[PDB]
Design a protein around this nucleic acid. Structure first.
Lengths: 453, 567, 53, 61, 149
RNA sequence: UGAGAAAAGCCUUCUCUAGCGAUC
């Protein structure tokens, strides 16, 4: 007589999020011994997913939002209006450092969103905590600087100087000067492999294992100057743009690109892919912004013609896309629930003091870092960052003992170079041809005068 | 870290989600509960542990249970008790077990656990809790008493409670409290069986099973008070009056030569015409007392009989008092009465306006104890009320009798009488003799009354001469200097220089410890019309250095209280 | 291996209960921490009775 | 970073961020820089390549 | 306009005291934890390597017999007591915890071919080539007296 | 030995023990 008899139900959609079994296949099994194992496999998967569905209540934060009223357009809303209507905590995160004596700046946030490091064209190198306004180090290397990146924790950062590649501590003391990596223009770090991928002006892509200190691969792209590069965090492959209009997929194991994708009628100047690995964003000389579907189809989902050129691109963790055109930035936002960004009308606009030279989103905050000739600015972007973070993976609020314990766990785990492929789950599949080769060996052990002719 | 905490929160999730399904609690309430539960969980999983954290956790869970219980009745939903209520109860039981394991020595935590088990837990859990308590805390008979009490009044099991009592006696063979409660317990068992027969073995129904305890307990504990104590519980039970009769008869025969037994027989006999009816009862009780006197002539027996007569007097009055003198004279002649009871009768007589018997008690006391000065004071108060002209004789006799020099109340009393009915020169003569006799700390009160007399008998000039002589006899008090300053204020002159001169002397003696004296000095410079308030800067500076320890803090607070209007 | 031990002390008598122990390798470098470390000792041994003098 | 435990050291042997002898030869190169104060790292390399060129000619002759 | 930005309360995310331990929120989102197959494979491979490092089966060796061991019998009630029988005819009782020999008896002449322990554990049975079946007492003989079946 | 040698103040990286925690 109790009005509701059953136990508490869980939403189907959240359960489907924690599922890794291909229900699509209709594989036949006519043996009971196979049947018992398969039913257990579904039972183990079903039980584990359900517990995670209930655990959604543990999540405590909510993503930001920004809507106009009475038909206001969000494009014309400026940063000054936002700072006044937002609390003192987030208002302190917006600041504009003005350093015009040195050249245009390239900025990189750490994987943990607490630290920021930047490098100047004329030779200014500095790393700082940006939440609190403290300066970790400030040095001036005599040569020009083309790129800067963090290596895993904030301790080490690699600077792409004029001649070779250099390694510095967080306190400014020089450690390594790698002469093999020469005239490199772009740098990017693979976190879970401890591989640093370098693109050089001479046309070579080089991989370095920062854990052991050995160069695993040095590949000749065979396309001339290399200036456009990005990685897919889900896929771990490297994308390389060329003046031909093609983007090449690379892995350290192969000596030839995994695939070539023709994206533009002219030269490509930017490439960026989302965290989930579903979409790619590219821009080129034909002033077209394109969104590509990386789940097997490789068709351009969205297209738009622009007055100026999108020099740089980036994605947040919620799916927002920002394009840096001249001295103006524009952010496109969409619902993102299994849909690409909608390029119909931009979400926010802002005009910088100088031309844009670098864009990147903070990992777990609603701010955007823009590097330009005038200096470095921090915008406020409501709805861009992921609200809830995992404590054992990336804590902004972590002590030293938490950090040094975490690093060894990642080092005990390090992925070999050759396992990088287009499918991150390719290790699950059985190698079909070796099955056939093995079966070959298994088989091996187991009228009247016409006759006179 | 939060591995165990996360396990516990995911264990706590299903009942919260069911509560959401009920409609009892809204989703925001569930979020707040999860937040506070995580905050409290982080407290009790640390490497450093405190009892306050366990108590806070238990209190939060109890408050949540009460809130749920209140809301269910309003909603009217009574299903799914097991999913929520029992889950919370097991979690609280685990917390209590861990806390009790950490702190075995704390009985108060054990009693909190017992109370929670009574309120919310199954009776078998409470049985296990009592067993665990009695395992390590067997040396406290009160715990055995509570454990046995729970069996009878709650579980209604008389036999199980008997074994808990019987085992308790082997651990504590000499505790009288265990015997009395066990004696009471069996008589309770008799009442249950008597009502049992009415609703529908003969020997137990008579109370024989309790009578066995009485004989054995008397043998182990050979005391008069204990045997009388067992009777008190026996009278409380109406049934089996023979049991009360049997024990009462044994009181006289077995217990003799002790005053308490004879007294109890007397008070039992105690238990306008009705006033006469009271009268013969008092005589019958008295006759018992003399029968005890010839059998037992010890001193202790007498006082119970004088105190009996004293109580009847204070509570017709003439007949009661006529008893008092006759028993007083009889006790006095055998000299057994002690000093203290002489005073008690004497003061009672004074309050009832009877001034001829009080003299007899006073005179009788002095001849027995000539050295005792307190009864000498008692005699003096009698003659003052009597107004007899023998006051002068009394002081001469007392001081000759009092060989020790220190008789402080006598010295004061002589000063009081001499002022009333003697010349002023003799009063000064008495005071000067007193200051010679007493040289130590007792002179403090002597000097204060000397100065007060000087202002009354003389004027301001006379007080000045007395103050000048005594300003060097070092044992002092602050009342000596407060009196002198007060006399200066009342005079019309109010020489402000003399005001400072007295305060400096007072601050020289008691400045190290007296915060109030420094405060009073500062207000004089302000409020007095002749004062110089520009000295207040220096007095505060001087006050800080001489004051030591806690007095330094009090002066600061009082002055800060003085700057505000609260004073 | 559940067994009871009687320990006699100047303050009184104590009765204790043993839950589990690795008997064979007890006198070994790694296993000896079972009794030495206070936390691990509390895991395997409890105080069930105490009667002081 | 932290001092590695006994079981950790076996699996994380040859892992050292600070010393990479095979790839850049920094430790041996440092001693030359300090012993004779060389302002720029380029100055040492131009010396090193040139010395090799002299050595090649002597071997070939 | 309606605006909100993510604003964490520091007291939620930071411990209160030096005595307290750091609080760690956990998110089980698959997007935050990629590479689930390759990451777990390395942990499994490292697990097998560790097992090979710590594989140390040998514990101790007991000596004292003067001829080859032929029979063994474990004691039902106590883990630490075993019995052995050698070719010379002697039977030795061993204390496993102390790694020494408690008693040595000359049970038979010639080989001993079998030893078994009575289920209660106060006696054992031995058989030798002298065509005899002998029962003995598990408890050691008192003081210095010689043992008898 | 040869980032010459000698002294004071600020950050960074790490090492040892000793309690503490595991009793539900």
């Amino acid at each position: 007589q109790d009005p509701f008899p059953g136990p508490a139900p869980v939403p189907v959609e959240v359960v489907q999020k924690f599922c890794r079994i291909d229900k699509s296949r209709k594989l036949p099994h006519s043996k009971a011994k196979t049947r018992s194992r398969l039913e257990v496999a579904e039972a183990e998967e079903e039980e584990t997913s359900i517990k995670a569905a209930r655990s959604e209540l543990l999540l405590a934060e909510e993503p930001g939002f920004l809507e106009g009223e009475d038909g206001e357009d969000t494009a014309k809303i400026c940063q000054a209006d936002i700072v006044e209507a937002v609390d003192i905590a987030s208002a302190a995160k917006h600041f504009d450092l003005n350093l015009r004596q040195f050249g245009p700046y390239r900025l990189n946030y750490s994987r943990t969103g607490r630290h920021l490091a930047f490098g100047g064209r004329r030779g200014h190198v500095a790393a700082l905590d940006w939440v609190t306004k403290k300066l970790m180090c400030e040095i001036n290397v005599m040569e020009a600087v083309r790129d800067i990146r963090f290596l895993h924790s904030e301790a080490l950062l690699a600077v792409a100087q004029n001649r070779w590649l250099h390694i510095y501590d967080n306190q400014g003391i020089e450690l390594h000067c790698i002469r093999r990596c020469d005239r490199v223009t772009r740098l990017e770090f693979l976190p879970f492999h401890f591989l640093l991928a370098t693109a050089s002006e001479t046309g070579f892509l080089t991989y370095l294992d920062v854990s052991v200190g050995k160069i695993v691969a040095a590949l000749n792209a065979r396309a001339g100057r290399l200036d456009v590069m990005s990685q897919n965090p889900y896929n771990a492959v490297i994308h390389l743009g060329h003046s031909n209009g093609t983007v090449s997929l690379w892995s350290p194991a192969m000596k030839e690109p995994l695939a070539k994708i023709l994206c533009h009628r002219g030269g490509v100047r930017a490439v960026a892919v989302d965290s989930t690995g579903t979409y790619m964003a590219t821009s080129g000389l034909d002033h077209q912004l394109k969104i590509f579907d990386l789940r097997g189809t490789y068709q351009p989902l969205s297209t738009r013609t622009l007055p100026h050129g999108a020099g740089h691109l980036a994605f947040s963790q919620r799916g927002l896309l920002v394009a840096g055109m001249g001295d103006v930035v524009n952010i496109w936002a969409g619902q993102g629930k299994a849909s690409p960004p909608s390029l119909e009308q931009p979400y926010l606009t802002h005009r910088l003091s100088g031309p844009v030279h670098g864009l990147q989103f903070c990992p777990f905050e609603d701010v955007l870092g823009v590097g330009h000739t005038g200096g470095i600015t921090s915008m406020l972007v409501p709805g861009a960052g992921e609200p809830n973070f995992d404590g054992l993976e990336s804590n902004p609020y972590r002590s030293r003992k938490q950090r040094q314990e975490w690093e060894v766990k990642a080092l005990l785990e390090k992925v070999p170079a050759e396992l990088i492929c287009l499918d991150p789950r390719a290790l699950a599949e059985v190698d079909v041809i070796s099955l056939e080769q093995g079966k070959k060996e298994q088989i091996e052990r187991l009228s009247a005068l016409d006759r006179f002719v | 870290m939060a591995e165990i905490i996360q396990e516990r929160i995911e264990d706590r999730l299903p009942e919260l989600e069911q509560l959401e399904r009920i409609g009892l609690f809204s989703h925001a309430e569930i979020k707040a509960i999860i937040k506070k539960a995580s905050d409290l969980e982080y407290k009790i999983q640390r490497r450093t542990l405190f009892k306050e954290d366990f108590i806070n956790y238990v209190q939060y869970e109890i408050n949540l249970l009460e809130l749920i219980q209140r809301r269910r009745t309003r909603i009217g939903y009574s299903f799914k008790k097991d999913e929520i209520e029992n889950s919370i109860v097991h979690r609280v039981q685990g917390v209590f077990q861990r806390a009790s394991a950490k702190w075995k020595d704390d009985v108060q935590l054990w009693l909190s656990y017992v109370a929670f088990c009574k309120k919310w837990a199954t009776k078998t859990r409470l049985s296990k809790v009592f067993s665990a308590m009695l395992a390590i805390h067997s040396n406290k008979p009160a715990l055995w008493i509570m454990a046995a009490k729970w069996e009878m009044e709650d579980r209604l099991s008389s036999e199980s409670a008997r074994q808990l009592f019987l085992r308790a006696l082997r651990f504590h063979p000499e505790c009288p409290k265990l015997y009395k409660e066990y004696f009471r317990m069996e008589l309770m068992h008799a009442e249950k069986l008597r009502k049992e027969k009415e609703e529908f073995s003969e020997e137990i129904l008579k109370g024989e099973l309790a009578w066995i305890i009485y004989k054995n307990s008397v043998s182990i504990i050979k005391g008069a008070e204990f045997h009388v104590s067992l009777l008190s519980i026996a009278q409380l039970f109406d049934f089996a009056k023979d049991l009360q009769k049997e024990i009462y008869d044994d009181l006289q025969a077995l217990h003799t030569d002790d005053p308490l037994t004879w007294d109890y027989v007397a008070r039992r006999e105690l238990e306008q015409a009705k006033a006469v009816e009271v009268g013969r009862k008092e005589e019958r009780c008295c006759a018992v007392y003399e029968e005890a006197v010839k059998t037992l002539p010890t001193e202790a027996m007498w006082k119970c009989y004088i105190t009996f007569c004293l109580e009847r007097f204070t509570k017709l009055r003439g007949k009661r008092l006529e008893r008092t003198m006759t028993v007083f004279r009889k006790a006095h002649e055998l000299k057994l009465l002690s000093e203290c009871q002489y005073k008690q009768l004497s003061v009672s007589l004074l309050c009832y306006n009877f001034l001829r018997e009080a003299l007899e008690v006073a005179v009788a006391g002095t001849e027995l104890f000539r050295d005792s000065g307190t009864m000498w004071q008692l005699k003096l108060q009698v003659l003052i009320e009597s107004k007899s002209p023998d006051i002068a004789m009394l002081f001469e006799e007392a001081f000759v009798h009092l060989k020790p020099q220190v008789c402080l109340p006598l010295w004061i009393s002589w000063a009081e009488w001499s002022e009333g009915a003697k010349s002023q020169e003799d009063t000064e003569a008495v005071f000067k003799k007193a200051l010679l006799a007493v040289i130590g700390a007792d002179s403090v009160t002597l000097k204060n009354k000397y100065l007060d007399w000087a202002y009354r008998s003389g004027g301001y000039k006379k007080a000045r001469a007395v103050f000048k002589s005594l300003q060097e006899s070092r044992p002092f008090s602050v009342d000596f200097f407060r009196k002198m300053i007060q006399f200066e204020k009342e005079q019309e002159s109010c020489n402000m220089a003399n005001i400072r001169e007295y305060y400096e002397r007072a601050l020289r003696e008691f400045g190290s410890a007296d915060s109030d004296l420094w405060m009073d000095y500062m207000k004089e410079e302000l409020n007095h019309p002749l004062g110089r308030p520009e000295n207040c800067g220096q007095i505060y500076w001087r006050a800080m250095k001489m004051l030591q320890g806690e007095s330094a803090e009090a002066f600061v607070a009082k002055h800060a209280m003085h700057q505000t209007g609260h004073l | 291996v559940l067994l009871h031990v009687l320990f006699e002390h100047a303050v009184g008598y104590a009765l204790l209960a043993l839950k589990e122990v690795e008997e064979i390798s007890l006198l070994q470098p790694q296993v000896e921490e079972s009794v030495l470390n206070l936390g691990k000792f509390h895991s395997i041994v409890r105080l069930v009775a105490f009667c002081p003098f | 970073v932290r001092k590695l435990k006994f079981h950790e050291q076996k699996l994380l042997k040859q892992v050292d961020f600070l010393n990479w002898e095979v790839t850049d030869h920094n430790l041996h190169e440092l001693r030359v820089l300090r012993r004779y104060r060389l302002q720029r790292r380029e100055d040492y390399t131009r010396y090193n390549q040139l010395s090799r060129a002299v050595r090649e000619l002597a071997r070939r002759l | 306009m309606k605006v909100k930005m993510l604003s964490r309360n520091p007291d939620n995310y930071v411990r209160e005291t030096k005595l307290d331990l750091q609080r760690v929120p956990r998110n089980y989102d698959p997007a935050l934890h990629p590479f689930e197959v390759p990451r777990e494979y390395i942990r499994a491979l490292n697990a097998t390597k560790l097992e090979r490092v710590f594989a140390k089966p040998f514990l101790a060796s007991l000596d004292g017999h003067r001829d080859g061991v032929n029979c063994l019998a474990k004691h039902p009630e106590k883990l630490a007591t075993v019995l052995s029988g050698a070719c010379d005819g002697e039977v030795r009782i061993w204390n496993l915890t102390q790694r020494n020999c408690i008693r040595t008896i000359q049970a038979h002449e010639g080989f001993v071919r079998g030893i078994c322990t009575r289920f209660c554990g106060t006696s054992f049975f031995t058989v030798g080539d002298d065509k005899t079946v002998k029962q003995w007492k598990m408890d050691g003989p008192g003081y210095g007296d010689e043992e008898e079946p």
